[PDB]
Ligand binder design. Structure first.
Ligand SMILES: C[C@H](NC(=O)N1CCc2c(cccc2-c2ccc(C(F)(F)F)cc2)C1)c1ccccc1
Length: 216
């Protein structure tokens, strides 16, 4: 279906942004990485596969770690997403947030873990609980303007400081984010997304690419 979905849950949209208030009337918002709600086109080809074994070490090993999650399954829930971040956006106290939306055929309470990882070691984990709302023959879950942690704020600023993009990509090669969305009381896994990043060498802006994770 070329979507980031598992039978239990679907990630409709994902956004990481900075917002600034130019004047009291006007606010400017720049998106670092963006995934939008797109309709599946009949024409579209299947998602390519990446052997999960090959990305194990980019994420912590023991627990909350790909190998273990993937053994727990369900293996249809596991995806990989490659962002090309737009790093061309400033002042003190602009707001840094992450805004996402999910859809389901059921109503649950979902818990969203987000581990920022460096060199496969996790530097921080957020945990968010989100509740179901009903629309369109589906239940949706909205996460509005969730704050960015400061690690990531410092990382983005200092990463933008670097003189050349190829350096940025050198730093990014051991930067990952692992996101696991569970049902809160079940702790059943609904959706796991591994995230890897590259700086957009084009001025084309934010791009992404989705691959299914497999264990042949
Ligand atoms: C709730 C909050 N979520 C986050 O902080 N984040 C971080 C930033 C981020 C996220 C998702 C996708 C992409 C990015 C991102 C990464 C890199 C770059 C670039 F351009 F710099 F490479 C640009 C955008 C989610 C959180 C709080 C505490 C602990 C962990 C998480």
């Amino acid at each position: 279906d070329r979507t980031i979905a598992s039978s239990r849950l679907r990630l409709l949209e994902y956004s990481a942004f900075m917002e600034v208030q130019r004047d009291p009337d006007t606010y400017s918002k720049h998106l670092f990485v963006h995934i939008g709600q797109t309709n599946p086109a009949f024409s579209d080809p299947p998602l390519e596969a990446v052997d999960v074994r090959q990305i194990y070490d980019k994420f912590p090993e023991k627990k909350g770690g790909l190998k273990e999650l993937y053994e727990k399954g369900p293996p249809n829930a596991f995806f990989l997403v490659k962002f090309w971040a737009d790093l061309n956006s400033e002042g003190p106290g602009a707001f840094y947030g992450v805004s996402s939306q999910y859809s389901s055929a059921d109503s649950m309470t979902i818990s969203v873990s987000t581990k920022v990882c460096s060199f496969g070691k996790q530097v921080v984990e957020k945990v968010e609980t989100e509740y179901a709302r009903l629309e369109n023959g589906r239940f949706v879950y909205r996460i509005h303007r969730s704050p960015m942690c400061e690690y990531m704020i410092n990382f983005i600023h200092k990463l933008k400081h670097l003189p050349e993009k190829y350096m940025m990509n050198s730093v990014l090669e051991n930067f990952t984010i692992l996101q696991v969305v569970t049902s809160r009381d079940s702790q059943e896994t609904l959706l796991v997304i591994a995230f890897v990043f590259e700086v957009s060498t084009s001025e084309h802006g934010a791009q992404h690419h989705v691959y299914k994770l497999v264990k042949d």
